[PDB]
């Protein structure tokens, strides 16, 4: 359906980057390595929000950046790691919406790329990955932060994501169909292309009447995505293969022959 997502990265003052997504559309960023670190709009539907909205977001990141420089120091102490090594703290949370209500909220954390601590599906308990996260879970259980997570995920995350979908309905609630074509290269290869589609969810399959080479969906840089699927066929047998494209922007699916 629809999802608002946030990705926080603190690398060891430390480097703090925060990014917000609505579906596959980025709408906010924060970079501690900017000339004036602040919450910057990445989508036109969030640009017209008042200065009281943006300054509250900016001071949120500015104080979240300070919270991570001490957290990385506390994490370095839990594991007895050296003060010279670089370490990464990752923070992930968001809310999924068909009736416009919370389908699932999530909250995950990662230290150095492995799972550290995560809010449970009940939004009232935690799961620690090791004895270091048990100190963090006990820290957040004393503060009862899972209660504040309920207030955000079940509420603030849902109503504000619903507002973003309304102000940007011209682009967010609009599926761009892929522009497909087949290329042929001699090897002694039939590549099926898909360009300029939104969202990134697409299915590329080469049928004959497990052997396709898929690539991960890449961003075009304009808000759309690209992806191709290549298969190897013997010479004189190209007329037997048909590429199939499934996408939300397509009235009916597309079949393609060389």
């Amino acid at each position: 359906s629809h999802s608002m997502r946030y990705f926080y990265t603190a690398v060891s003052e430390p480097r703090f980057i925060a990014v917000g997504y609505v579906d596959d559309t980025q709408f906010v960023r924060f970079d501690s390595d900017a000339a004036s670190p602040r919450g910057e709009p990445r989508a036109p539907w969030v640009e017209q929000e008042g200065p009281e909205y943006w300054d509250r977001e900016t001071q949120k990141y500015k104080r979240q950046a300070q919270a991570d420089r001490v957290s990385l120091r506390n994490l370095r102490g839990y594991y007895n790691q050296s003060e010279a090594g670089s370490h990464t703290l990752q923070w992930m949370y968001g809310c999924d919406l068909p009736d416009g209500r919370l389908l699932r909220g999530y909250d995950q954390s990662a230290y150095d790329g492995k799972d550290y601590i995560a809010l449970n599906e009940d939004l009232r308990s935690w799961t620690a990955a090791d004895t270091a996260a048990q100190i963090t879970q006990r820290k957040w259980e004393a503060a009862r932060e899972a209660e504040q997570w309920r207030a955000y995920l079940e509420g603030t995350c849902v109503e504000w994501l619903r507002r973003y979908l309304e102000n940007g309905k011209e682009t967010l609630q609009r599926a761009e169909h892929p522009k497909t074509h087949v290329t042929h290269h001699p090897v002694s290869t039939l590549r099926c292309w898909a360009l300029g589609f939104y969202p990134a969810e697409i299915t590329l399959t080469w049928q004959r009447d497990q052997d396709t080479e898929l690539v991960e969906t890449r961003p075009a840089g304009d808000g759309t995505f690209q992806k191709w699927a290549a298969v190897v066929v013997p010479s004189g047998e190209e007329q037997r293969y048909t590429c199939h494209v499934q996408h939300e922007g397509l009235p009916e699916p597309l079949t393609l022959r060389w």
């Binding site: 608002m4 946030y6 925060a18 917000g20 906010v28 919450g39 977001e57 949120k60 990141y61 104080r63 979240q64 919270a67 991570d68 001490v70 957290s71 506390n74 994490l75 703290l89 923070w91 949370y93 954390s109 550290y116 601590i117 963090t136 820290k139 957040w140 503060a143 932060e145 504040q148 955000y152 603030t156 995350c157 504000w160 994501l161």
Partner: peptide, 9 residues
């Protein structure tokens, strides 16, 4: 709309 200030680890 981002999450408010979270407690430290």
């Amino acid at each position: 709309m981002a999450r408010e200030l979270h407690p430290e680890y």
